[PDB]
Design a protein around this ligand. Structure first.
Ligand code: UDP
Ligand code: UDP
Ligand code: MG
Ligand code: MG
Lengths: 393, 393
């Protein structure tokens, strides 16, 4: 079995997040790697952006990323990438023709990639598996255009792979999806890498990151886009410092795009610290060093940062939003905040910072919790999904 | 020979202009009709927007328009149509597969249509002929995206068909076009329909349109978009009425999208009159009834209204812009204004309104002039263009 995965607008090889690179990228790369271990051949197609990488990147046995040239290597933001839909498809058509390579099935990620895959599937007479990841309908002409396309994929993909059950409800409610085509594939997290793990480990991480050993630490991890709520953490942190101006707290925010600006405006620059985005082998230390990981997302999806925080033995305080309620066992492995007000987040941060015994236990419980996912697990579900799709064509 | 013409975002069957329908539409339909008379089979592919029309419209022997479903029949403005690039292509792929129809060559119109045709041409192993019509580079992310695509077509089409020589210079200067691929196909105008034509004809047209027989008439014809300059005519007309408040002048503006609003604000509503867009058999009367046709375009292309005005024996006052200097023999068949100031246009309008002998002669000379184009003529050039392209594949 050879699968073509399509990831048009962002490459699995991009440092997540910064950029347009986040959970979706690591979802695609992690599932792909596990599929490849299981004997399944995966080619992940993405738009070429870094010519030093070459056309074909051999990632591991059975795993390749294909950088397809379509428009300049730069000066094209996500919003304009629709203009490259036909060219990127054509890119894949040449590549496959040139390399004489045939696929059993296509698995597209995000609506741009799906539009590509819908054309390819009729042409190649193979099935399309589509994963939305995020949806317009969950108010501009550009979003109505995107919705309309998301609507097309819903009506045409052979299988709609969603990441949670709540996402399946969304497909059914907002997109009139036929439930017989939706299929829940519950995601994973690299649970061997992200891990507590050793009794000296937190304080080793702290030495390594230059954090003082005796202080409480809250961490934000991920893209510094406003829908991710880092502003909420900074605002909440400021609130805590009005209540008690010498609270023993430091914040590390990690990593990529100003918020430092908001933090000076609010008088808290000295206790906040912005870490550059880094690869997973190095993010572990951020998680380990943190007492609490705050994930104040406005939109979401399926909660990957929450999962890795948990895996690594650190309780999470998340927004009641997207996948987070499922990624976090409210009251057992962390807290869920309603809304994004600074007052509410200060309260929730205060209750875990001041109650040592509770927080220490949430952390331990989270490890057991996070072990319910499992990229391997995720691949095994996709494995079956694929087999069925092929079986039924 | 079967040619597939691609016209994604606007259909040759749409009333020009209103809408997104103008010279390009009538260019595509007129060339197509003449190609069909000459024994060449044309299928013009367009996005389906009016379901009462059905999938295939038999226009005349060898001529069909194909309405391809791709996104809603409405709520999708031109700016969003990139999101339907892959779907519209896929639409054409199904249709051709379903109908078992094969093409010798593709001729695409406008950058959206070309992106579609570029993919189709590699897939079908046939040549692509591309006609830009208008170009971004002749300042937003959306226009930079469009330019970038226009740049792709320049680099990839087998033949770049331009409408004038000045357009070829643009391809070479702004798009680094290789001159060996550019080919000038000079356009036409329906010169039997648009025509003076009979000594009672102007005053017959006037009775028909309800215009007073003894008054000077200026006409604007075409889309009421701001780049078309109707505001310039209205502003200029107002200027004339400051100079001489009982000048014997009436204006007819025809036709589709406020300007009436601008005309009241300026005190001239009573001498201006907005005609609904109408089909060519009925536009003749507007041209015939006019003493002068004002074409204050800001952008352009290749000057179709100017040509039909001329054909119908009416002198033109045009902006020194796009094709207009070639469509109009400055000083022989009308005037060319530099810039779009009201003062300049009043001057130019005043010199032709007050000098009866000159204007009457320009009109007669214009008839002889307009006979240099010739949709038949245009088709014959495309005929050869096609044969060469096929011959050289
Ligand atoms: O320095 C960093 C910070 C972020 N992450 C990764 O970024 C992803 C972001 O996940 P999140 O769900 O919060 O972003 P989203 O999916 O909302 O786009 C996670 O997998 C992290 O492991 C990373 O690799 N390095
Ligand atoms: O009521 C009308 C007014 C306009 N036209 C047609 O509209 C086209 C507009 O041409 P123009 O070049 O001025 O518009 P553009 O090409 O700039 O889009 C011409 O072919 C006209 O014959 C028409 O068919 N009916
Ligand atoms: Mg920790
Ligand atoms: Mg006349």
């Amino acid at each position: 079995m050879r699968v073509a995965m399509i990831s048009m607008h962002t490459s699995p090889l991009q440092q997540p997040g910064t950029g347009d690179s986040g959970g979706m990228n690591v979802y695609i790369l992690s599932t792909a790697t596990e599929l490849a271990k299981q004997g399944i051949e995966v080619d992940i197609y993405t738009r070429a952006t870094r010519p030093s990488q070459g056309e074909i990147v051999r990632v591991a046995e059975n795993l390749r990323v294909i950088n397809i040239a379509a428009g300049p290597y730069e000066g094209l933001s996500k919003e304009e990438l629709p203009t490259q839909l036909a060219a990127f498809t054509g890119g894949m058509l040449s590549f496959t023709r040139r390399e004489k390579v045939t696929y059993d099935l296509i698995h597209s990620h995000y609506w741009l990639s799906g539009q590509v895959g819908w054309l390819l599937r009729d042409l190649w007479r193979i099935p399309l598996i589509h994963t939305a990841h995020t949806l317009a309908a969950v108010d501009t002409p550009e979003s109505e255009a995107r919705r309309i396309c998301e609507q097309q994929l819903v009506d045409n993909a052979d299988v709609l792979a969603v990441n949670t059950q709540e996402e399946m409800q969304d497909l059914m409610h907002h997109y009139d999806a036929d439930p017989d085509r939706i299929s829940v594939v519950s995601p994973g997290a690299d649970v061997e890498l992200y891990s507590p793990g050793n009794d000296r480990a937190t304080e080793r991480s702290r030495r390594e990151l230059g954090i003082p050993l005796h202080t409480k630490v809250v961490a934000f991890v991920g893209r510094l886009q406003p829908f991710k709520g880092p502003q909420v953490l900074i605002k909440a942190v400021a609130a805590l410092f009005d209540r008690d101006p010498d609270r023993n707290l430091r914040v590390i925010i990690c990593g990529g795009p100003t918020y430092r600006h908001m933090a000076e405006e609010l008088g808290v620059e000295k206790r906040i610290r912005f870490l550059d985005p880094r690869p997973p082998s190095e993010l572990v230390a951020v998680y380990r060093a943190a007492d609490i990981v705050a994930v104040p997302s406005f939109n979401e999806s399926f909660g990957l940062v929450a999962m890795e925080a948990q895996a690594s033995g650190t309780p999470v305080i998340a927004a009641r939003v997207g996948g987070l309620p499922i990624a976090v066992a409210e009251g057992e492995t962390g807290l869920l905040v309603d809304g994004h007000s600074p007052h509410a987040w200060a309260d929730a941060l205060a209750t875990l910072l001041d109650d040592d015994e509770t927080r220490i236990r949430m952390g331990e419980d989270a490890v057991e919790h996070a072990r319910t996912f499992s990229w391997a697990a995720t691949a095994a579900q996709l494995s079956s999904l694929y087999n069925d799709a092929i079986a039924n064509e």
